[PDB]
Design a protein around this ligand. Structure first.
Ligand SMILES: Nc1ncnc2c1ncn2[C@@H]1O[C@H](COP(=O)(O)OP(=O)(O)OP(O)(O)=S)[C@@H](O)[C@H]1O
Length: 317
């Protein structure tokens, strides 16, 4: 085929016709600029926000965060909550692990007091409770802790002959379908924490519109012991912007995600902040000597912090 121009035009209608029936994120080029909506739940880390493309989590979708135990998910999730919350939004927390610490959550910015919590007996109850709580069209964000802890009724009792094995993947399958509808039809985004899959996974893997692979990189040293960690997240799936994009941020013990720290790391890799060796400078005057001093600077001089964060959004968005 001695073609050339008439190709790019035909390929247009291809994609064009693909999206028209399968959705707008069905086909993409890893290079495509990202589409951008009105609502988006900031994750609390400008780095990851600019790796999700839309600058934060997508409403009306189902998000999946998975990875080793003690990676960062619940933090990354609780943050999403604090944001959705600080915008006058209401959130619920479906607990199947019984491992939430409000003091921490509160430090991150969660308004625990008005944080709706639920602790289901069986897995179905947990998902059925999340359903209506979703159909009310009142919740902004809902997070189910552990897709691996939602044991079906059967297993929880004595089981049945009929045909068992793989009761979750079904409990999930069924659930996910009935739910997907109410989600992308109410504007409530739902987060599913997965503990490192094949569990109830499969189902979710596909329904999920954004899949996050969270993992700890190093144990952030601090001259002393260990303030926080160096988490690395990678959107393995993302129907809202080109996927396979990754980000890294710090999680200070008891402090949570270091917004400021991200402000700096993104700052330098965007030319807005300079590095005169150990020295962190920003458009003239100095920020400090060493990322921590820098961070410690931004944390209090919160007035400038916002300036920098503001500009990075005018630079990429
Ligand atoms: N209650 C807490 N108090 C102090 N630090 C915490 C607390 N919960 C989490 N962290 C820190 O945050 C990081 C892990 O976030 P987690 O909430 O454990 O998320 P995961 O998403 O890692 O969670 P499991 O799956 O580990 S709860 C680590 O660096 C922890 O030290």
């Amino acid at each position: 085929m001695t073609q050339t121009p008439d190709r790019e035009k035909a390929l247009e209608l291809a994609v064009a016709q693909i999206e028209k029936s399968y959705g707008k994120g069905s086909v993409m080029r890893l290079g495509d600029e990202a589409r951008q909506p009105i609502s988006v739940i900031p994750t609390g880390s400008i780095a990851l926000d600019v790796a999700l493309g839309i600058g934060g989590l997508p409403r009306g979708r189902v998000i999946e965060i998975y990875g080793p135990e003690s990676s960062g998910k619940t933090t990354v999730a609780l943050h999403a909550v604090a944001n959705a919350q600080a915008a006058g939004g209401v959130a619920a927390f479906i607990d199947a692990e019984h491992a939430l610490d409000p003091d921490y959550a509160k430090k991150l910015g969660v308004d625990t007091d008005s944080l709706l919590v639920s602790q289901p007996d069986t897995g179905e109850q947990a998902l059925e409770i999340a359903d209506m709580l979703i159909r009310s069209g009142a919740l902004d964000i809902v997070v189910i802790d552990s897709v691996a802890a939602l044991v079906p009724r059967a297993e929880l009792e004595g089981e049945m002959g009929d045909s068992h094995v793989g009761l979750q993947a079904r409990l999930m399958s069924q659930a996910l379908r009935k739910m997907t509808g109410a989600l992308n039809n109410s504007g409530t985004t739902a987060i599913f924490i997965n503990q490192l899959t094949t569990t109830g996974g499969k189902a979710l893997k596909f329904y999920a519109s954004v899949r996050m692979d969270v993992r700890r990189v190093e144990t952030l040293k601090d001259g002393t012991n260990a303030v926080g960690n160096r988490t690395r997240v990678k959107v393995v799936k993302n129907k809202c912007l080109a996927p396979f994009k990754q980000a890294e941020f710090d999680i200070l013990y008891g402090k949570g995600i270091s917004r400021e720290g991200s402000l700096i790391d993104m700052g330098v890799d965007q030319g807005l902040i300079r590095k005169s060796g150990a020295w962190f400078t920003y458009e003239g005057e100095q920020l400090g000597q060493g990322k921590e001093n820098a961070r410690n600077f931004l944390v209090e001089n919160a007035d400038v912090a916002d300036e920098i964060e503001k500009k990075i959004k005018e630079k990429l968005g």
